[PDB]
Structure 1
């Protein structure tokens, strides 16, 4: 049997960005609220793993206070209208959990200068 793999493939979108931990993003959603179908826009930072296929969480933080203001955007969700990639940081690690106990001025996703 293969029908489950074709079912996830018709629910996934025909192109989406391949972002990773240490990336910044700008996202637009229509919030599924009511008759106006009104748009909401946001810009933030990714330190959570994407990860792969239909069930990507796409967890984004603002990284500007000692509390991250976390939101789960879901890459393949039909409530999303645009997903845009901005910049990438000088990190090499993918876990990055130490940044959850720092404020935004101590979580600038590294610069290194090698």
Structure 2
């Protein structure tokens, strides 16, 4: 609706970089421990992106010490500060959910080099 769309538009942020699934991304998130506020870095691979405007979100999978961790970030939430892209995966699928089953040498993807 016009009323809703206008309401969400004012809450946007224009500093959202353009990234695609398969791109290695490090997302900086705010962390609060009682009264102190710190920056925590989460680096991984974007395996799915959901575009819905103010409700847009993306999920990042990283291989930790033993098992993988998947985190879903709300793109326009104040918790996320900045998003930076290191690699440009040369995938051709919107959703990289098949990477969950794969591991080791089979979880790597090529470089777009574009």
Give the alignment's TM-score, normalised by structure 1: 0.82
Measured after TM superposition, the shift of residue 79 of structure 1 is: 1.2
CA deviation profile, 1:57-111 (whole Å, cap 9, x unmatched): 2110004688431011211011122211221112112233221111142111235
Distance 1:72 1:96, change over 3 A: closer
Aligned counterparts of 1:30 and 1:112: Cα–Cα separation in 2: 31
Residues 8-67 of structure 1, C-alpha deviation per residue, up to 9 Å, x if partnerless? Answer: 111111220121211110111112443111211121101112424111221100046884
Q: Which runs of 5+ in 1 are unaligned?
A: none
Distance 1:75 1:33, change over 3 A: farther
> Unaligned stretches of 5+ in structure 2?
none
Is the CA contact 1:27–1:42 (under 8 Å) kept in the aligned structure 2?
Answer: yes
Cα distance between partner residues in 2 of 1:74 and 1:105: 30
**Greater strand content:** 2
Tell me the TM-score normalised to structure 2 length: 0.82
CA root-mean-square deviation = 2.7
